[PDB]
Design a protein around this ligand. Sequence first.
Ligand SMILES: [Zn+2]
Ligand SMILES: [Zn+2]
Lengths: 50, 548, 1345
Amino acid sequence: RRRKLPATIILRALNYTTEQILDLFFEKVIFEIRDNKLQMELVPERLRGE
Amino acid sequence: SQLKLLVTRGKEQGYLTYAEVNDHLPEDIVDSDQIEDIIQMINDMGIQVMEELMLAENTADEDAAEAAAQVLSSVESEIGRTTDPVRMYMREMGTVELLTREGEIDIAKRIEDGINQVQCSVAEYPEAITYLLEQYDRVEAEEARLSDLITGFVDPELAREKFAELRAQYVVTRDTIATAQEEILKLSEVFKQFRLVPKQFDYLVNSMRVMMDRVRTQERLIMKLCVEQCKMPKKNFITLFTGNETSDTWFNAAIAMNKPWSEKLHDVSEEVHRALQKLQQIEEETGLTIEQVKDINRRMSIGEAKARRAKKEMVEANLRLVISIAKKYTNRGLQFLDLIQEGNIGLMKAVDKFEYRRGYKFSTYATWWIRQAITRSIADQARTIRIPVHMIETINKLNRISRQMLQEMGREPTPEELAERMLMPEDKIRKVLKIAKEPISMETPIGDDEDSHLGDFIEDTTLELPLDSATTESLRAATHDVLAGLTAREAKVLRMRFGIDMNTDYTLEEVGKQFDVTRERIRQIEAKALRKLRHPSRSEVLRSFLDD
Amino acid sequence: EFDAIKIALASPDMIRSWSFGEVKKPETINYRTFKPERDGLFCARIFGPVKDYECLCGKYKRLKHRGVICEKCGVEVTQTKVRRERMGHIELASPTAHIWFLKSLPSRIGLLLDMPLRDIERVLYFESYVVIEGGMTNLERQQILTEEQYLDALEEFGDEFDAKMGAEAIQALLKSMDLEQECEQLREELNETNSETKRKKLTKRIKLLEAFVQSGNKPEWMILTVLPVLPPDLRPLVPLDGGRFATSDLNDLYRRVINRNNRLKRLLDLAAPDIIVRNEKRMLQEAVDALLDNGRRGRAITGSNKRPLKSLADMIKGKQGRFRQNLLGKRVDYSGRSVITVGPYLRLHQCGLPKKMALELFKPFIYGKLELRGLATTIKAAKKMVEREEAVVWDILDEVIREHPVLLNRAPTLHRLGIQAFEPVLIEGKAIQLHPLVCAAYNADFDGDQMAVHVPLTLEAQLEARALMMSTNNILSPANGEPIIVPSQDVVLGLYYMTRDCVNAKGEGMVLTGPKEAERLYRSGLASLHARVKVRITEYEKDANGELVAKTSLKDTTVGRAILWMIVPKGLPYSIVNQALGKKAISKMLNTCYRILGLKPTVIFADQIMYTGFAYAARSGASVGIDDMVIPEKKHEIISEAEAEVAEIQEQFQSGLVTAGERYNKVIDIWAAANDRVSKAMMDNLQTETVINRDGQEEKQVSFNSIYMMADSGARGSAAQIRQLAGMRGLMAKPDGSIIETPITANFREGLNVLQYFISTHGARKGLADTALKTANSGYLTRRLVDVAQDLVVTEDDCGTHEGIMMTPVIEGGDVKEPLRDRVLGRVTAEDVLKPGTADILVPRNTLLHEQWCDLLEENSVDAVKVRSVVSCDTDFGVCAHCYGRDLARGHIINKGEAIGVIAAQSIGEPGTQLTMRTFHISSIQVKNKGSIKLSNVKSVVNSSGKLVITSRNTELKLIDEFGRTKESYKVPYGAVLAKGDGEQVAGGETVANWDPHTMPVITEVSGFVRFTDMIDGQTITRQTDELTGLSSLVVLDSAERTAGGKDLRPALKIVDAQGNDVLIPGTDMPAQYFLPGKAIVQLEDGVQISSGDTLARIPQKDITGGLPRVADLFEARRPKEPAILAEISGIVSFGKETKGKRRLVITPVDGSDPYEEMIPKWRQLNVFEGERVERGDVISDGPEAPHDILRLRGVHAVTRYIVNEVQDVYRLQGVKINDKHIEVIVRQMLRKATIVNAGSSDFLEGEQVEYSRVKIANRELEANGKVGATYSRDLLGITKASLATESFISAASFQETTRVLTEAAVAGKRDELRGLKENVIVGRLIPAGTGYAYHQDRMRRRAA
Ligand SMILES: [Zn+2]
Ligand SMILES: [Zn+2]
């Protein structure tokens, strides 16, 4: 019932650095310069209800 | 501070839960007690705290609201604020040095010299040595126990001759009162080889203290009469009074000063002459001067204070020792701090009875005295109905032979079995095991619907029922009637012989003196009246009061 | 005997004078011979003898030694009651602060010395030192030092400086301090200085000092130098069964104090090491505080059995304390308890009392009567006779019982009709037979309920059961005049079966010569109870002056109504019995019998109605069978249609046409419609289905279905419950409101399979659990309102004021909801009320408007009547008899000595038991009838269009026909396009005005060109492009996105003529231009015309709570979260600095303090323009009104009208009726506090909150003088704070925090003149309310002779 530390502190205590943490809890959107200024790597389903 | 936002948060929401209180606390508040006290602060003002249509009421307040808010703002900085006795004492006991590793013998030597200074100080007093020769003569003349004066020395008969020798030396010291100084030094060096009983020594010291008090009280009668009423000047009274102390010049040749203050002491003139003669007379009552015995008991109080200011240090260390020892009885029906206090008192007891002469370490012996005194105070003041200490020891040995007889005999002890294994007569063991149980609290929450307690069902066995008071007033009326049916002889003599409508019932002789007749006539008259009352028409109404 | 209860501190000499001896040893008793040990906590030498008139040793036992102090053990020979009043004292060798005066928060010790709390408790426990007049060297009076600071002080500053430690230091500090000197210094710091809140706290301290001077207290008494021990028989140690004693914890606490005190004495006389002595002093202090109030400084100690030992403070305070649980309500003799049964043979004033329960309650009276009649020689013979139940004891008992009433009382006595007095009837059994009609009063049925019986013993107490608390005097409910002698369930059905008719029954259509012949026909078996028939009945009418003019005629009635007519008393009409007589009609018949014929005829009518109802209900044989729940045969096809529509929706959901929540809502809507359809089908099959033949073919009438008869008569049932028996059960609901979509399409007649039953158990158990709380927390509102409004009593027949309330009908929405005859009935008018043409002096001022004057009022169609209210009464400490009106029940006029406060609380709280325990939520005018237009705030313009538009803001429009009465009321917006305008009397089928929420107009005064002045786009206006019409729009916006260059500047639309001159606003020389805030689209251009109020700027685009929490909150007077700010002052408005959450709203009065300004929360939709003259007591933004706001603005009648209407809304929502007198009384207690605006010639503080009655009397007697009074300002409190402020500290300690109250009383030295209902009850005296009010008046006359 102690004070409410943030939730990433325990993820760090488990020896997780920031990079693989964000790899754990999220998905990935890919951008690249394919001759026009960082084209987007589009997915069909993710653009629903937007 | 951050708790301010917490109070305003609780006031916004109208409540405060244990989660938010655990969050918003000062982080290094490690003290759960001040935690409880600060939540009791935030609640005692209102808002009310919980742990998870909350429309009851507010209950408070514009006066205590800012009071508790002020206490919170202060307590945000309350760093060392445990504020309870058991922890405050531990703090102020560990804070003091544990400077005791066979420095006890150095402290003991300090006490040894300090207690010999008081010895020599008293022994330089003439009238006390007179008292000692007195008690040698009385204790050997059968006034008390034969060793009721001395605690040994560095033998009844050679000791009596020793004391006759000391008596001769001191009485010639008195004979040769300069010449008296050398003989009083003789006195001191010849008594310096002896050792008195500490009770006689105690009366000695208390008599010196009464000397000091009376001499200072005559000091007050001298000074306050002019030095505190007429405003007698300070430094001139100093350089004249102390500095002369004997002659008439300090007062009789000072009334002739005609100063602004010597024109003020003609009022107390004869009074301060009484004080002067009392000075010289008390010098006789003590034998020697006021200055002499005064500085005597002064240096004696120096030595006594020197001794006491070391028992302080060793009781500091050994009181850490007592908090060590006491913790074996935390669940004996006595408070922990009271245990530690009894241990401290016993520790002073043992410190005044600790001896380096056996070369024994302090702890093992002071802990002896401390365990003694602590078990003593437990047996004394741990139970409301005080059973004496021996009864507690008996119930303890009964209990100790009860666990044994249980683990062995399987089933349970019994008074037959216990009177077998123990040496008691099978019935006082009955009463012992009847005695041991504690009075249940009268506020025990009963297993009822109304939140009832055990104190609500304890009936009353002394009250007389109003059918039994209206069955006594009816009897008083009936007897007043049935006595009215009678001559003044019988009526008066029966109201007087018994307590009827009157004060104390008199004997026969008092009734006779009221009637001027001898007791046997009174007996005949009362028997006549009772015979007359025994028959019906005078008995039917009284008799119905007898349901037997 | 004794006048007021004085209170103060206790001098150590006073505490030594109380005691009868010191307590030196912690010994209770000896362990073998249980006699008091010493000189101990139980001592015969101090606390009197342990046996009556008996010394301890035994040397003195006769009464003749009465009073002696025995030579051996010094035990004064006297009564053992003496052991229950003598007190001891413990002599604390060290001082010890009173924890009440060190943790009272504010600490009285602390706030007296002006030393903060932690400093005090740091010098207390020897953590530090505190100087006490530390000489002429370095320091302050209360300068606290640390240890080493003091050590180095004694070096450099040896003497002529004294700093102590511990409670000794606080004692010396309080002692040396001189109150008048510091009080002077506080005067100088208060009047020579101006730092507002600092001077608020300063003046609080100043008042405390002046109170401590006014009282006899000395500050150095807050440190216990001497401690008194309670008398032993209050903290007893009693022998139980088995020799194991039983003790109250106070013995433990006294013992712990005494041991520690003796040990401190020991250690002090050992010259002990002073750290140990510090610990002993600290422990003794903690012990004294556990003794005084355990668990108030640290953690409760302990107890011996692991539970917090209770101390004296615990003995007083707490719900389970002494002020509450044996002081206000205690156990009582002469009382019994038994299972109540019914016994319908009783008369309404009597109840069956078992012989066995009556022979025990009257044993004193029976003994007396036996000994009086000589049947028994003495009291003992009498007792024996009663003990063997002789034959004569039943005659003696029938004579004791005869005129002796007994009080019958059910458990939760919510309202005062729960303790009623009956005359007993010695019945055989062991169950009280309770008259049926009373069970609605008691709220008691016979499923096993029990009742308590008490005997009113004395003469004056057994004429109060006869004159006040008797069952026959109480037939009207005090919460509303409607008689609570309503026949309930067998009687209304007996009367419904009796007074009905059938199309063709035996003996139809035969002329009868009176009710007697109808009864003889029915009993003979020649004509049925409902056969249409003509009877010559003779009815009387006493509209004559007391005389009953008769009239006989051939009524066309039935045999049932005929037979019932014999029962009716004389002066009632025949239409009262010539309908089918439901339950509503059955109690209206009783109400008319009362309002024509007083009380006694109604009392006889009640049990006559009850006997005849039971008789003919039994005659009817009205049973119930499983064939009486005729299910409609159209239920199956309706359910097939419903399942079809639900399948349609499921397919449209699988097709992608609706969300999931939308399918849920549409499914629930389909099933709800289907359930209403099936219930209407079953009711149409039930109600009329009886088809009979009259001289031929056929005819339908009202059905004789047994279950339908129960539903229709009003005995038991509804459409909902019959529907569940016959129709479908519809949709269940989970507990949290989550309606299940699978509906129980079955009823209980047919089966319920497993799944439907398990579904229904959800809401079933939720309802059960909810009424498991609403029973537990039964009367908490009455308790909270008997706390705030208890000591009001009607104490004057007239205050003679002229102030009241302008009571009118609640004509809201359409037709009225509550007419004028409901709300003006029983109150005395405040002023002579004339006809609308005034025609006469219609109603005098102080005439009690009973039924006749209400007839007069609604013949003339009087719409508004001023009627005196109790919140305006000028009485002192009470309420005049006329400013309360007519009292219900008794129904004549309240007589002085009525405790109207308790009654008001009980009448708001018994009805509140019938309310929901949870709080729950819920173009063109379709004007209704013919009537005329009614304008409030008449400022309208007729456009060039011809229709009207409100150029005012809050113009309220009413439809008022030729009656004089108002028939419709409506709130009109700012300038709706009114089809009908001002005064235009029109009829139904004609809308009064068209409008649009997308259209809030900024219509002007005159017609003309709208030039654009003070308008530069880019700073205040927005570019709204007309893609809809083909133009350009510059819409008014604020500084939300435009920069601050011209952000505050308003876009001015200059309405001018064709020449270019600024046309003024007709009325004020400021021309007809408008400064516009946002939300009003502008479709004009610069240099464009508009008609007479043409569309310049157009602004594009009922829930009620009802739970009993919505009454606890209505009364608690809190502040809503959308609080509609009002118009504080009249005059004009200015808007200033924005974008802060408080935009400046300046109010320039006409002739007042012109720079007046306030703040505005700019998240809000501000709904008033800046040019319109603000009117004081008027709303600006629209939202819920705050009570304190109304109270400060419009007046006490404004707040009272608001509170009364809101509580009446929540009470009428559930149909529960309660009068408004009671809520006006609760309000009158609510706004009891005045505040001092100007000190004036008055003698209160500057901004001090004082009792409004106090300021009233003071400034009134000054107004009689030549000096200017104090200009008060009335506050408004919540019930749990209007009760917090009470004059008498006894009652305050009763229902409040006791330690706070007694600490305040002790310091202030208050004297409690017992003149409240809740104080006298505690001290055993008569309450100064009812029967004892004359006695208390005679007491007040004896005092000050
Ligand atoms: Zn005696
Ligand atoms: Zn009045």
